[PDB]
């Protein structure tokens, strides 16, 4: 089957910028079967390009579709502010309807460095038997951040889940907020609970830790 | 005007089936085809097949051929979608968009694009049956400030089905606020978080509650997070009060000799009681002049005392008359945690009178090298011990000056002295000080003598 | 030395049989009678009967001329007493006692009163079994923790707190008999709330009529594991009060001073009192006491006297008089010292009669001593080298900027105020150029 | 036939006081044999005067007896520290030995309240199958108490147990001991428990209580 593989995974930029989508296919599409579309968070997609290259009624002239053979783009001449979303690319037609992954366009700014705040399990929690250890990792920037938990200097791992917001609309930056969740068995049974934070605006791994009950 | 309506989200368990319409409007129905494509959590879209509402010709994905059934109906302007034996995995937002406009230029099917699509439908499949959320603060602790703020916050976790709203400070907390995006559990129970960042100050004097919401349950919940006490059962035992006392005690005081025989100030007596348990901290009082009750009194308000202990205080402003003439007073106070009622009397000290002497003397000359000087008020032979000594100069009251205690004589009269305090300058510029005294044995209950300097200067 | 010594207890069953022995010594057992008498819990002694050893003859009480053999063995020196048909009613404390000397001038008879008692064998009759205790400890909420001894049979039980370690405050109560047939006593002791944590209470419950021996723990209980300044009791009973030496003592090389300790409501019942005092936190045994005194309203008052150095006393060494009652739960501590800060010079300045007194026939010599600390001053008047007599000096006063002051007045014929002789106000105080100044008075 | 009735039943002295005891009998004792007799609790009794009047060897000259007819007389001339015990007078001789009920010369020192405390059942015997609560009054004086329980604010009877000690040799003070016994059925069915004391060293009757729970 046609296999659409889109580039670049993030594609951050300012308004007014010039932004260019790629969509490369395992495939030729001579069909020219190709199109574009638009998805915020929450709203339904919207067609922005079709036949690789024609606006649908509604688009300003600001994007154009272009490629042919194997690669396809999209281009925004001047980033504005109500662009930055997903876009998806696909082939469609003759029972071939397949899409891209995405490409998306986040805001711009400056390199921002995650205020990491660390919180052992809730007194109450450990009624129940499951200890929560939430670590938060505030307003930071570019996106790519690493988190990993150490109880007892103990490299943990396949027990924590992570969450992310969306780019925050005021400052352009986002929050992440991994748990880490063991039995109040485990949980009793360390001493150091700590969760070491990495990032492209951390010159070192920051790592904010706590020990079993202490104040 | 081109628009298309689906239904509303379902939950629905592993076996079930799910069947969302499409209803469109501003474009002719059945001169359009109808795409259902779905896009599960982390996946991309997936296109499942296209009926035609002209003919109700229909293609299918191989992925759905086998479990989809796309039927249209004209007169509704509706295209339903029915997927049946929903496993987990087909949990997503399952979506319906039409053609493009059949152009002129384009060959069969050059046009069959997701041209306009609906707002999708959420379908949870899962075998969680509706459960309600847990409430347990992420506390800050005392970390270093260094130079930033503090962040607290709630965990929402062990919830099903999603969504959940939440709010700090009933919509008062908003800026700095953070509710993360919900996190499915091994045990098929979504997770979650909301945080807010707030000056590390404010800690120990603002109120932060979340308030939480998950109608699936009916649930509300609304906790304080509050910083965890450093105290871990500080050791320090409850009930910390003494009992060791026939009850509480009872003090009596009389009135200040000067308010007795002079006019300006009015004759009071005091009844003091302490050791007010305070597990029976009501107290009433009683007067009786010599015998015959009175209400005319009036009573202070209750204070704390420094171990555990109640100060209570009624006092009966008296009269001249009375208490001169030897009128017996009575205070009787009775409490719960008192056996008996304790009364005890109070009236003037009774004795045979005797006329107070009064005397000046001047500084001795050796004083007269220091910067300030002492006058002297000798005043012997009175009787009984109640007196008030004043010093007053151009018609305005001396501040500085201290009296000692009446002191018992040989012959059983008392005798006291007042000394005065004043500025060499004033001694030496001829100023005239006078000695008050008031005494019951002294005409008109009032006596004065002067001093000042020699004449000369 | 006559010795009636009695056999061990017994513990028989309804309708069971018991037979106790009594071995005589230091007399010659046959010629003497022997009397047995019983006492049941609660009930008057019984005389049961005797036994004369010299020639085996008895006597009977009518209550227990049926059931009872009083035996005597004229070569083992021992006389017994066999009882049948054990009722619950039999069960008491079985007396072996002789009869006295007799003597011509005594009628037949007129010594037959108990002169010499055993020690008593105990025999208790009850349908119940050998039980071991129950141990169940009495946990803190002074506070006191025990032990309970419950369900157990026969008596004795002998409990032991940290294997004898723990003795005063301890109360092991007397057992009760509960209608079960099986016995319930309780051991307290009241220890020291400031130990509840740093302690390890443990009692040593032993019962060896079955061979039962549970030790356990008298800890508190799980619901918490900071002191601001407690205050004292008063069980209304005796009171002491420190006073500090005569101001004229400790200046005077002559003079001796003495710091007295005085205690009053010391009752009639227990009079004795003990004194302890401590110079600094060491111990001294110079102290003297006096003969109590009878108050007028029924109590005593006790006084202690314990001389100091002037220097010590001068210097600011505390003085602690400690005192102790039987009546006093704990004993009562007082301490005393010179009063501390800067030491102050007083001025004293003296002041002639005021003009319209020398209308009267006695004047008033004044004399103003001012600016001094401690308050600690002693002030006399002289002339003629002699010690004058008539005069008062007001206490100290104290003053606007933390000083003391007082006047003393001396009384004189205005003659011979007016006749010029002179007189002179003393002060002593140690902040004094030598402790010692004086100012001079007179006419014109 | 003969009946001894002794008065009073205890006699409260202090050391150096003068203490006499009275043996008053239904029979007229013409031949003069009566006895007194002193008994210390644990301890063997001793003789203390026969035939009315005659000191027994190695008996205090402190010691006297008189009387005659039907009423006959014990008397400590000054009580001496070692003199409380029981006192019992007695006929004897020709198939007439009857003994009075005794008369307790007890130490007497100025009241003292007692320390009233109560204790909870030991967990450990609620399981079992019965409860029993506690309450101790330490070192009070005189010998007279009145412990009444209160099971949750109700005038229990009947199922509780006193125990008084002998008079300290030291403070000369008793210290009661009554224990409340219920089965754990019985126990929990109330929710507060309570013990009253009344004391002369108490005008306002104490109770000192525990609610019955976990701490």
């Known amino acids: 089957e046609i296999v659409l593989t889109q580039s670049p995974g993030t594609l951050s930029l300012s308004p007014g910028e010039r932004a260019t989508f790629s969509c490369r296919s395992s495939?030729?599409?001579?069909?020219?079967?190709v199109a574009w579309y638009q998805h915020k968070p929450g709203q339904a997609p919207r067609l922005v390009i079709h036949?690789?290259?024609n606006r649908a009624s509604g688009i300003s002239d600001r994007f154009s579709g272009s490629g042919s053979g194997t690669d396809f783009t999209l281009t925004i001449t001047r980033v504005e502010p109500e662009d930055f979303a997903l876009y998806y690319c696909?082939?469609?037609?003759?029972?071939?309807?397949?899409f891209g992954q995405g490409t998306k366009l986040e805001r711009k700014r400056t390199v921002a460095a995650p205020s990491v705040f660390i919180f052992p399990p809730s007194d109450e929690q450990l009624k129940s038997g499951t200890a929560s250890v939430v670590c938060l990792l505030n307003n930071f920037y570019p996106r790519e951040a690493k988190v990993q938990w150490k109880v007892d200097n103990a490299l943990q791992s396949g027990n924590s889940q992570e969450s992310v917001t969306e780019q925050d609309s005021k400052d352009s930056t986002y929050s992440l907020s991994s748990t880490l969740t063991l039995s109040k068995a485990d949980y009793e049974k360390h001493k150091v609970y700590a969760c070491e934070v990495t990032h492209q605006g951390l010159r070192s791994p920051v790592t904010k830790s706590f020990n079993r009950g202490e104040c | 005007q081109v628009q298309l309506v689906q239904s509303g989200a379902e939950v629905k368990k592993p076996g079930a089936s799910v069947k969302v319409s499409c209803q469109a409007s501003?474009?002719?129905?059945?001169?359009?085809?109808i795409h259902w494509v779905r896009q599960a959590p982390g996946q991309r879209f997936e296109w499942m097949g296209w009926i035609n509402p002209y003919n109700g010709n229909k293609e299918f994905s191989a992925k759905f051929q086998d479990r989809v059934t796309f039927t249209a109906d004209t007169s509704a302007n509706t295209a339903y979608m029915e997927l049946r034996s929903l496993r987990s995995a087909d949990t997503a937002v399952y979506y319906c968009?039409?053609?493009?406009?059949?152009?002129?230029?384009?060959?069969?099917?050059?046009?069959?694009?997701?041209?306009?699509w609906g707002k999708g439908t959420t379908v949870i499949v899962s075998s969680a049956s509706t459960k309600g959320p847990s409430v347990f603060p992420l506390a800050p602790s005392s970390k270093s400030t260094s130079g930033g703020t503090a962040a607290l916050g709630c965990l929402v976790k062990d919830y099903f089905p999603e969504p959940v709203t939440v709010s700090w400070n009933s919509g008062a907390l908003t800026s700095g606020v953070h509710t993360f995006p919900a996190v499915l559990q091994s045990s098929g129970l979504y997770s979650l978080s909301s945080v807010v960042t707030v000056p590390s100050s404010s800690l120990g004097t603002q109120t932060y509650i979340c308030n939480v919401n998950h109608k699936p349950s009916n649930t509300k919940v609304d906790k304080k997070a509050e910083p965890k006490s450093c105290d871990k059962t500080h050791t320090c035992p409850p009930c910390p009060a003494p009992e060791l006392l026939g009850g509480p005690s009872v003090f009596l005081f009389p009135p200040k000799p000067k308010d007795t025989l002079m006019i300006s100030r009015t004759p009071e007596v005091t009844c003091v009681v302490v050791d007010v348990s305070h597990e029976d901290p009501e107290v009433k009082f009683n007067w009786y002049v010599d015998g015959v009750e009175v209400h005319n009194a009036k009573t202070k308000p209750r204070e704390e005392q420094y171990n555990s202990t109640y100060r209570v205080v009624s006092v009966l402003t008296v009269l001249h008359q009375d208490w001169l003439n030897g009128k017996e007073y009575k205070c009787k106070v009775s409490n719960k945690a008192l056996p008996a009622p304790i009364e005890k009397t109070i009236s003037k000290a009774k004795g045979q009178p005797r006329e107070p002497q009064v005397y000046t003397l001047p500084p001795s000359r050796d004083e007269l090298t220091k910067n300030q000087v002492s006058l002297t008020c000798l005043v012997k032979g009175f009787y009984p011990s109640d007196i008030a000594v004043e010093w007053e100069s151009n018609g305005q009251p001396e501040n500085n000056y201290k009296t000692t205690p009446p002191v018992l004589d040989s012959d059983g009269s008392f005798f006291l002295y007042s000394k005065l305090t004043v500025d060499k300058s004033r001694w030496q510029q001829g100023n005239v000080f006078s000695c008050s005294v008031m005494h019951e044995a002294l005409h008109n209950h009032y006596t004065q003598k002067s001093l000042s300097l020699s004449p000369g200067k | 030395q006559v010795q009636l010594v009695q056999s061990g207890a017994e513990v028989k069953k309804p309708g069971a049989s018991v037979k106790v022995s009594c071995?005589?010594?230091?007399?010659?057992?046959?010629?003497?009678?022997?009397?047995?008498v019983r006492q049941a819990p609660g009930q008057r002694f019984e005389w049961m009967g005797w036994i004369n050893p010299y020639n085996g003859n008895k006597e009977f009480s009518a209550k227990f001329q049926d059931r009872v053999t009083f035996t005597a063995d004229t070569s083992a020196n021992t006389a017994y007493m066999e009882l049948r048909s054990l009722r619950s009613a039999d069960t008491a404390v079985?007396?072996?006692?002789?009869?006295?000397?007799?003597?011509?001038?005594?009628?037949?008879?007129?010594?037959?009163?108990?002169?010499?008692?055993?020690?008593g064998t105990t025999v208790i009759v009850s349908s119940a079994s050998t039980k071991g205790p129950s141990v169940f400890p009495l946990a803190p909420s002074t506070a006191a923790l025990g032990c309970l001894v419950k369900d157990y049979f026969p008596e004795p039980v002998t409990v032991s707190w940290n294997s004898g370690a723990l003795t005063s405050g301890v109360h092991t109560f007397p057992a009760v008999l509960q209608s079960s047939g099986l016995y319930s006593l309780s051991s307290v002791v009241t220890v020291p709330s400031s130990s509840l944590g740093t302690q390890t209470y443990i009692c040593n419950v032993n019962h060896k009529p079955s061979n039962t021996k549970v030790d356990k723990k008298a800890e508190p209980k799980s619901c918490d594991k900071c002191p601001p300044c407690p205050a004292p009791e008063l069980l209304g009973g005796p009171s002491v009060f420190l006073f500090p030496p005569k101001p004229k003592d400790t200046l005077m090389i002559s003079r001796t001073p003495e710091v007295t300790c005085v205690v009053v409501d010391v009752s009639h019942e227990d009079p004795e009192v003990k004194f302890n005092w401590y110079v600094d936190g060491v111990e001294v045994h110079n102290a003297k006491t006096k003969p109590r005194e009878e108050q007028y309203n029924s109590t005593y008052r006790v006084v202690s006297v314990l001389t100091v150095l002037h220097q010590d006393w001068l210097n600011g060494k505390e003085y602690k008089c400690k005192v102790s009652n039987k009546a006093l739960p704990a004993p009562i501590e007082k301490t005393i010292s010179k009063a501390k800060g800067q030491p102050r010079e007083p001025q004293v300045y003296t002041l002639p009669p005021s003009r319209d007194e020398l209308t009267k026939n006695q004047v008033s010599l004044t004399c103003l001593v001012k600016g001094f600390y401690p308050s600690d001053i002693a002030v006399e008047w002289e002339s003629n080298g002699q010690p004058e007599n008539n005069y008062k000096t007001t206490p100290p006063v104290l003053d606007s900027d933390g000083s003391f002051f007082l006047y003393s007045k001396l009384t004189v014929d205005k003659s011979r105020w007016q006749q010029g002789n002179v007189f002179s106000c003393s002060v002593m105080h140690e902040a004094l150029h030598n402790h010692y100044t004086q100012k001079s008075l007179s006419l014109s | 036939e003969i009946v001894l009735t002794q008065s009073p039943g205890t006699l409260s002295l202090s050391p150096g006081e003068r203490a006499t005891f009275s043996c008053?009998?239904?029979?007229?004792?013409?031949?003069?044999?009566?006895?007194?007799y002193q008994h210390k609790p644990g301890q063997a009794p001793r003789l203390?005067?026969?035939?009315?009047?005659?000191?027994?060897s190695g008996i205090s000259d402190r010691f006297s007896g008189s009387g005659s007819g039907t009423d006959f007389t014990l008397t400590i001339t000054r009580v001496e520290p070692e003199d409380f015990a029981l006192?019992?007078?007695?006929?004897?001789?020709?198939?007439?030995?009857?003994?009075?009920?005794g008369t307790k010369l007890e130490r007497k020192r100025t009241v003292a309240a007692p320390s009233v405390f109560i204790f909870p059942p030991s967990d450990e015997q609620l399981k079992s199958g019965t409860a029993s609560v506690v309450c101790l009054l330490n070192n009070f004086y005189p010998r007279e108490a009145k412990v009444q329980w209160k099971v949750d604010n109700a005038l229990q009877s009947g199922n509780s147990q006193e125990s008084v000690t002998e008079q300290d040799s030291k403070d000369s003070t008793y210290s009661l001991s009554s224990t409340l016994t219920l089965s754990k059925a019985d126990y929990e069915k109330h929710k507060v428990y309570a013990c009253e004391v009344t004391h002369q060293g108490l005008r306002s009757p104490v109770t000192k209580s525990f609610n019955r729970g976990e701490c």
């Open positions: 495939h030729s599409i001579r069909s020219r079967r």
């Open positions: 501003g474009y002719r129905f059945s001169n359009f085809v």
């Open positions: 968009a039409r053609v493009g406009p059949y152009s002129w230029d384009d060959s069969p099917q050059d046009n069959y694009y997701m041209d306009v």
């Open positions: 036949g690789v290259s």
């Open positions: 696909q082939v469609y037609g003759a029972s071939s309807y397949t």
